[PDB]
Design an enzyme around this catalytic site. Structure first.
Site: not given
Lengths: 130, 130, 130
Positions: A77, A108-110
């Site tokens: 996200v 795997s959010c950034v």
């Protein structure tokens, strides 16, 4: 036998170079969804409201295929404000277990520079069904 | 039969809506790891030090599962300074071959706006074991 | 049996900690390609020219392996200007169908802060061949 391609009547819909989602068979995958407001068709300012709608769209596609968020193996996200993740993360985890998704899919959010449709957040996760 | 879920006592640990990693069976996957300093618990300023720790965490999880970095099929890493990649890339490739990972897994690194925990870098790669 | 590793004489080539691409067998994957100008070796200013070259490189690798873009299950592309996507998206979809790729692979494009080699765009998609 099947491969990718996932039609539905809830997600943002596909009318360009991509489909609503892709069902490889046993291992599904959802495209970068977006909080396409049901009344504005873009992205609600309410980080919480838009964050909730985005989750429904991603699940609506996987649900229309024959699966559930609980099956989600991994999730990604993109956020426009890591400071807002405090509310999204609190509601993101509180809904999984509230939906029977304690498995806890990969993350795997950034904080990305921008997003399609000027959306304040994007969702793209994978799901299985062995 | 197995599917996702990877426990370990080295990685950043999972206490939210995600697990340390996911083992789909034969094809493993690591979540967006981070240089959670062993003394600060966040991300060392030393781009090299934090870059090395992040690699250990990602490998620690895959190792605790029963694999190695050499098996890594693909890899993704978000950077906060593409100018620093010069040192990370030099040490990133020098360690693979130094660990017996000449296979050279796919790459997908880019300069993101920000990262979780204000980390100056993130790691997320895939691994196989056919 | 095969696993990752994809050599070719068209893509940007691999000389570091990664290979041109990876062939897991039946399910291929392309690394984050880049519009490495054939005359400048980096990234043409012509968002359209660089966008076209990047597509050829990604396809050149998959083609050298024994597949086609039409088989692409999912696709990801990082942009340095979401405002330029208007031209890339128009040509991106117009080429797929023009190449026999109406399947429409998943999408995952976002506006990243920066990219390797100062490239104005990156490409990373997956492909199948059941």
């Amino acid at each position: 036998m099947m491969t990718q391609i996932i039609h539905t009547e809830k997600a943002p819909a596909a009318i360009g170079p991509y489909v609503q989602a892709v069902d490889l068979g046993n291992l599904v995958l959802t495209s970068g969804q977006i909080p396409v407001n049901p009344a504005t068709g873009e992205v609600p300012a309410d980080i919480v409201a838009q964050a909730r709608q985005s989750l429904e769209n991603v699940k609506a596609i996987i649900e229309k295929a024959g699966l559930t968020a609980a099956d989600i193996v991994k999730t990604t996200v993109f956020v426009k404000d890591l400071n807002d993740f405090a509310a999204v993360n609190a509601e993101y985890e509180r809904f999984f277990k509230e939906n029977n998704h304690p498995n806890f899919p990969a993350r795997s959010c950034v904080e990305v520079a921008r997003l399609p449709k000027d959306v304040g957040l994007e969702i793209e996760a994978i799901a299985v069904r062995k």
